[PDB]
Amino acid sequence: MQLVLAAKYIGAGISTIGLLGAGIGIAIVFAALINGVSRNPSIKDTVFPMAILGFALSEATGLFCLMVSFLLLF
Amino acid sequence: MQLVLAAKYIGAGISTIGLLGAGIGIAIVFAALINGVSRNPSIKDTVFPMAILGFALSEATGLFCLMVSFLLLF
Amino acid sequence: MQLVLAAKYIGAGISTIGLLGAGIGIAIVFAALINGVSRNPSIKDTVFPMAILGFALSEATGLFCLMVSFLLLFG
Amino acid sequence: MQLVLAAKYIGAGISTIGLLGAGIGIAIVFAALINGVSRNPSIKDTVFPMAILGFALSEATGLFCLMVSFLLLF
Amino acid sequence: MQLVLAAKYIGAGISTIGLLGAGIGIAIVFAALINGVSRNPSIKDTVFPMAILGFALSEATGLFCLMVSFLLLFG
Amino acid sequence: MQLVLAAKYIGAGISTIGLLGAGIGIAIVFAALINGVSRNPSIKDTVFPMAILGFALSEATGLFCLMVSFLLLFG
Amino acid sequence: MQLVLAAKYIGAGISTIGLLGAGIGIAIVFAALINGVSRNPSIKDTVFPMAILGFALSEATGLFCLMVSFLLLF
Amino acid sequence: MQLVLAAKYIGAGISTIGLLGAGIGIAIVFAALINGVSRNPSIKDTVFPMAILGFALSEATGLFCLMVSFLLLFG
Amino acid sequence: MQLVLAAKYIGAGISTIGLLGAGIGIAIVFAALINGVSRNPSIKDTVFPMAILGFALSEATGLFCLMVSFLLLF
Amino acid sequence: MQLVLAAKYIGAGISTIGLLGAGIGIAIVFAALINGVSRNPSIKDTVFPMAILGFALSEATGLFCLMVSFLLLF
Ligand SMILES: CC[C@H]1/C=C/C=C/C[C@@H](C)[C@H](O)[C@@](C)(O)C(=O)[C@@H](C)[C@H](O)[C@@H](C)C(=O)[C@@H](C)[C@H](O)[C@@H](C)/C=C/C(=O)O[C@@H]2[C@H](C)[C@H](CC1)O[C@]1(CC[C@H](C)[C@H](C[C@@H](C)O)O1)[C@H]2C
Numbered sequence: 001m002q003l004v005l006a007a008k009y010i011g012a013g014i015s016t017i018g019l020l021g022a023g024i025g026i027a028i029v030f031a032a033l034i035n036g037v038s039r040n041p042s043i044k045d046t047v048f049p050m051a052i053l054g055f056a057l058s059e060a061t062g063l064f065c066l067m068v069s070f071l072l073l074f
Numbered sequence: 075m076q077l078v079l080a081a082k083y084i085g086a087g088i089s090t091i092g093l094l095g096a097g098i099g100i101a102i103v104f105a106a107l108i109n110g111v112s113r114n115p116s117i118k119d120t121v122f123p124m125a126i127l128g129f130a131l132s133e134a135t136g137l138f139c140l141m142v143s144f145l146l147l148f
Numbered sequence: 149m150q151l152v153l154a155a156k157y158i159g160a161g162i163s164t165i166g167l168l169g170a171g172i173g174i175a176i177v178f179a180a181l182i183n184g185v186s187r188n189p190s191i192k193d194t195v196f197p198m199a200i201l202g203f204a205l206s207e208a209t210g211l212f213c214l215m216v217s218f219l220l221l222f223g
Numbered sequence: 224m225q226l227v228l229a230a231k232y233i234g235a236g237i238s239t240i241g242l243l244g245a246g247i248g249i250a251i252v253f254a255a256l257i258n259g260v261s262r263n264p265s266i267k268d269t270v271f272p273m274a275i276l277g278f279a280l281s282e283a284t285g286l287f288c289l290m291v292s293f294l295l296l297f
Numbered sequence: 298m299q300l301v302l303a304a305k306y307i308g309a310g311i312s313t314i315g316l317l318g319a320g321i322g323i324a325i326v327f328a329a330l331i332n333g334v335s336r337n338p339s340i341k342d343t344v345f346p347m348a349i350l351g352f353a354l355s356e357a358t359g360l361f362c363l364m365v366s367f368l369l370l371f372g
Numbered sequence: 373m374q375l376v377l378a379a380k381y382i383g384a385g386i387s388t389i390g391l392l393g394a395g396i397g398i399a400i401v402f403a404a405l406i407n408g409v410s411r412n413p414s415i416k417d418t419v420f421p422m423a424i425l426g427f428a429l430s431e432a433t434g435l436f437c438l439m440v441s442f443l444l445l446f447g
Numbered sequence: 448m449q450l451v452l453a454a455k456y457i458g459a460g461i462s463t464i465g466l467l468g469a470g471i472g473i474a475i476v477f478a479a480l481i482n483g484v485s486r487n488p489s490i491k492d493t494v495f496p497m498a499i500l501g502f503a504l505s506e507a508t509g510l511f512c513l514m515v516s517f518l519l520l521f
Numbered sequence: 522m523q524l525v526l527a528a529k530y531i532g533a534g535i536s537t538i539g540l541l542g543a544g545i546g547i548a549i550v551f552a553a554l555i556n557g558v559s560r561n562p563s564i565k566d567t568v569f570p571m572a573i574l575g576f577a578l579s580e581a582t583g584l585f586c587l588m589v590s591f592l593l594l595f596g
Numbered sequence: 597m598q599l600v601l602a603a604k605y606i607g608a609g610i611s612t613i614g615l616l617g618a619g620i621g622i623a624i625v626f627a628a629l630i631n632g633v634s635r636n637p638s639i640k641d642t643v644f645p646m647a648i649l650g651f652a653l654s655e656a657t658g659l660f661c662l663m664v665s666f667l668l669l670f
Numbered sequence: 671m672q673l674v675l676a677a678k679y680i681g682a683g684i685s686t687i688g689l690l691g692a693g694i695g696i697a698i699v700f701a702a703l704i705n706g707v708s709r710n711p712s713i714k715d716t717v718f719p720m721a722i723l724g725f726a727l728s729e730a731t732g733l734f735c736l737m738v739s740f741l742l743l744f
């Protein structure tokens with residue numbers, strides 16, 4: 001039983017690694033938003049909702065990691 | 075039978091690591107969409123379907139990881 | 149057999165790591181398709197099949213990872 | 224109990240790996256802010272709040288890692 | 298015997314990690330093909346075979362990983 | 373007690389890995405500062421404080437890793 | 448002996464990780480060949496032998512990994 | 522104590538991984554310095570101290586990794 | 597003794613991972629050579645020796661990994 | 671005393687992983703040197719000392735890794 005609980009806790013720690021992908025990806029999206037608005041200010045209203053969508057989709061990958069992490073923890 | 079269960083939980087945590095690829099890749103597609111539209115607003119209708127296709131394909135790699143994750147958990 | 153079964157399950161999880169390569173790669177190809185068409189709209193019908201081919205070959209690397217994963221889980 | 228507690232501490236350490244994602248992402252956002260402002264100084268007031276949003280969302284992914292680390296530690 | 302078998306299966310899973318290199322690399326090549334053709338459509342016939350060569354050579358590194366994987370799983 | 377202590381020390385080492393993020397990120401910020409100033413020297417006073425902010429925020433992620441490291445080593 | 452043989456097989460697997468470096472590097476070289484030829488077709492005969500040298504040297508790093516893998520396997 | 526000492530030595534090795542961050546980061550900063558001066562020779566005396574500062578802050582992340590490494594080895 | 601020999605073999609496998617850095621770095625150098633000659637053909641004789649030096653320095657990092665790997669193996 | 675020795679050898683192999691950073695970073699410096707010189711041949715004498723400095727500093731990070739490596743081995 002020591003073994004099973006110990007595996008849940010190590011597994012939960014490992015499950016957070018994938019969050020680095022959303023950390024990096026969210027940033028890549030906002031970088032593009034910023035570069036895009038700087039080069040073409042008039043395009044802001046068009047690309048801002050695209051950036052919000054990109055963020056949410058990238059972020060969803062982190063949510064799934066965290067879901068597995070919490071499932072293992074609790 | 076404790077050792078096998080422990081392995082399933084460790085394996086499940088490890089199985090989420092690959093989701094970082096979708097996290098980054100989704101972002102890469104949206105970055106291109108945003109920069110492409112900022113440089114050429116008129117191309118938006120053409121490249122948006124391409125972005126949907128590209129992110130859906132990149133995302134699916136992470137769903138495959140999660141499939142293995144949930145197999146090992148349940 | 150408890151130890152061997154355990155090893156199959158950990159190995160199965162480890163075998164999914166390589167899928168991050170196709171995750172990034174597929175995105176890289178579609179990013180180029182998008183930036184290529186934005187800079188040159190008239191090239192679309194030429195570069196679109198190239199992106200499909202590129203996607204498929206990158207995807208195949210993930211297919212090989214998942215195959216090993218499923219062989220360890222079931223085979 | 225020793226084995227479970229050992230697993231908690233190993234897992235706590237592993238749970239900080241994903242913070243490298245926010246480390247890189249935060250910088251990616253600020254690099255774009257700097258480059259965008261250098262190319263187009265007049266756009267600063269527009270992009271600065273986007274950079275703040277971008278960095279906060281990237282950072283939060285690493286804070287979710289840290290949160291799991293602390294749950295395991297304490 | 299249990300320990301050796303378990304090691305083979307763990308190793309087999311580990312062996313697929315390097316496949317991420319080909320996954321990313323194949324895509325890098327096709328990205329260049331697409332951007333190169335978009336910038337200069339007339340160069341297509343020259344650069345397409347360079348992309349096939351590049352993809353094949355990148356792919357081979359993944360094949361080497363998969364080979365070791367299969368040697369462990371079966372051999 | 374031997375097992376818990378060993379786990380603390382292994383964990384402490386693992387906890388420093390994330391520091392690579394700040395190592396790369398701090399540099400990414402200063403690279404942008406340098407390229408931004410080279411392209412537009414007059415923007416220096418505007419972008420320098422953005423680089424300090426960016427570096428500090430990136431650095432903090434590494435500080436969080438080191439904090440966990442020290443909690444394991446001592447606390 | 449079982450433990451030593453186990454270690455050989457685990458080590459053989461680990462020894463292939465470094466091949467991802469040649470996988471990416473080989474592609475980096477060919478991407479530059481393609482982009483350089485697209486921008487300046489007349490330079491092809493000059494850069495092609497540089498790309499062959501570049502790819503062979505990158506690949507060899509992965510072959511040294513594979514060599515260690517086989518030494519452990521056999 | 523054999524297990525704890527073993528853990529100190531493995532932890533010490535693990536604690537050097539994060540140095541790859543400073544390895545890449547330091548290079549990123551100097552790369553920008555070089556590309557910045559090539560594009561604008563007259564900016565050299567302005568961007569050179571910025572590169573030194575950038576190097577130092579990136580380097581510090583590696584210093585923290587090595588400190589933990591040496592604490593595990595000796596402290 | 598099983599333990600020590602087993603540690604030598606796993607350690608030798610792990611020691612090859614760092615070779616990925618030279619795999620990637622050698623490629624980055626040759627990419628720059630290629631892009632540089634394509635943009636400015638007359639600069640070839642100046643930058644080719646720089647590329648050879650860059651290659652050798654990056655390559656030396658892989659040599660050191662392999663040295664540790666062979667020390668562990670033999 | 672077998673377990674401690676085993677750990678030293680494992681630790682030594684792990685200690686070379688960080689050398690990949692120098693491998694990539696050395697290359698990054700030389701890439702910049704090559705591209706900088708191709709775009710502006712006249713700047714060569716100015717940027718070459720900067721490249722020497724940058725690669726020497728990046729390389730040293732890998733030497734620090736190797737220091738730990740050789741401590742654990744000898
Ligand atoms: C696919 C799901 C994602 C949804 C995205 C929706 C985007 C639409 C868009 C309009 C947003 O709502 C937004 C930009 O307005 C927005 O994010 C706001 C809600 C948000 O308040 C924003 C303005 C901020 O200021 C934000 C930086 C907050 O100050 C900061 C405290 C929150 C950071 C953060 O990561 O929160 C997350 C995030 C919203 C994520 C986003 C989740 O949600 C939270 C709560 C739910 C779980 C716990 C997730 C886990 C995470 C790892 O995915 O974290 C939630 C806790």
Ligand SMILES: CC[C@H]1/C=C/C=C/C[C@@H](C)[C@H](O)[C@@](C)(O)C(=O)[C@@H](C)[C@H](O)[C@@H](C)C(=O)[C@@H](C)[C@H](O)[C@@H](C)/C=C/C(=O)O[C@@H]2[C@H](C)[C@H](CC1)O[C@]1(CC[C@H](C)[C@H](C[C@@H](C)O)O1)[C@H]2C
Nearest residue numbers: 127130131134135138200203204205207208209210211214
């Ligand atoms: C390695 C060869 C690849 C083949 C590529 C072929 C390219 C040609 C091109 C014209 C395609 O057919 C395509 C662009 O039309 C295409 O991908 C469609 C079939 C696809 O429906 C696409 C348009 C989508 O809408 C797609 C995002 C779906 O909505 C989504 C549910 C599927 C995602 C996905 O990754 O599916 C995979 C993929 C096609 C992969 C692609 C495999 O195939 C599936 C089925 C077979 C096995 C199970 C693989 C495993 C995977 C890990 O490689 O997954 C298959 C399950």
Ligand SMILES: CC[C@H]1/C=C/C=C/C[C@@H](C)[C@H](O)[C@@](C)(O)C(=O)[C@@H](C)[C@H](O)[C@@H](C)C(=O)[C@@H](C)[C@H](O)[C@@H](C)/C=C/C(=O)O[C@@H]2[C@H](C)[C@H](CC1)O[C@]1(CC[C@H](C)[C@H](C[C@@H](C)O)O1)[C@H]2C
Nearest residue numbers: 201204205208209212349352353354356357359360361363
């Ligand atoms: C260095 C060896 C590589 C050779 C490359 C040769 C390139 C030349 C070029 C002319 C090709 O043949 C090609 C572009 O025409 C080509 O790939 C075709 C064969 C292929 O049908 C292509 C046009 C596709 O349509 C392709 C996207 C398929 O639809 C898709 C199902 C296959 C993906 C794939 O990765 O296949 C691999 C690949 C060819 C790999 C590539 C092998 O081969 C397969 C079959 C042989 C073995 C089993 C390999 C092992 C793999 C892990 O390396 O997998 C084989 C399973």
Ligand SMILES: CC[C@H]1/C=C/C=C/C[C@@H](C)[C@H](O)[C@@](C)(O)C(=O)[C@@H](C)[C@H](O)[C@@H](C)C(=O)[C@@H](C)[C@H](O)[C@@H](C)/C=C/C(=O)O[C@@H]2[C@H](C)[C@H](CC1)O[C@]1(CC[C@H](C)[C@H](C[C@@H](C)O)O1)[C@H]2C
Nearest residue numbers: 424427428429431432434435436438574577578581582585
């Ligand atoms: C979010 C917190 C970070 C705060 C950043 C604040 C930035 C504002 C800005 C004005 C700075 O203060 C600065 C640019 O002036 C600055 O860094 C100076 C303090 C500093 O002296 C700078 C000018 C240097 O010359 C610097 C390159 C030093 O020569 C060098 C020995 C220090 C490197 C270093 O990383 O120090 C860290 C750093 C400041 C970090 C950064 C901490 O702080 C130190 C001391 C406090 C604790 C121990 C942290 C822990 C670390 C792991 O995060 O390490 C501290 C040990």
Ligand SMILES: CC[C@H]1/C=C/C=C/C[C@@H](C)[C@H](O)[C@@](C)(O)C(=O)[C@@H](C)[C@H](O)[C@@H](C)C(=O)[C@@H](C)[C@H](O)[C@@H](C)/C=C/C(=O)O[C@@H]2[C@H](C)[C@H](CC1)O[C@]1(CC[C@H](C)[C@H](C[C@@H](C)O)O1)[C@H]2C
Nearest residue numbers: 573576577578580581582583584587723726727730731734
């Ligand atoms: C985190 C704060 C950093 C301080 C940066 C200060 C920057 C100011 C700037 C003007 C410097 O002093 C410098 C550019 O002149 C400089 O680095 C020189 C001192 C240095 O001699 C440089 C010109 C070299 O020639 C250098 C490549 C040497 O030939 C080489 C033997 C040393 C490499 C090296 O990484 O040394 C480190 C470094 C300076 C680092 C730098 C530490 O310091 C040393 C001594 C202290 C400890 C042991 C650190 C550990 C390391 C892991 O951070 O290693 C120190 C051992």
Ligand SMILES: CC[C@H]1/C=C/C=C/C[C@@H](C)[C@H](O)[C@@](C)(O)C(=O)[C@@H](C)[C@H](O)[C@@H](C)C(=O)[C@@H](C)[C@H](O)[C@@H](C)/C=C/C(=O)O[C@@H]2[C@H](C)[C@H](CC1)O[C@]1(CC[C@H](C)[C@H](C[C@@H](C)O)O1)[C@H]2C
Nearest residue numbers: 500503504507508511648651652653655656658659660662
């Ligand atoms: C810091 C040491 C490095 C020295 C670089 C010297 C560069 C100068 C430059 C003029 C070279 O000599 C060169 C470009 O002419 C050159 O590399 C030639 C010798 C080489 O024959 C080249 C023309 C090739 O065609 C080359 C692609 C070969 O065909 C190919 C079979 C060899 C690949 C390879 O990686 O070999 C290595 C490499 C030279 C490396 C390079 C080592 O050396 C070998 C033999 C020694 C050990 C075993 C190393 C291990 C490696 C992991 O560092 O591998 C050696 C086995």
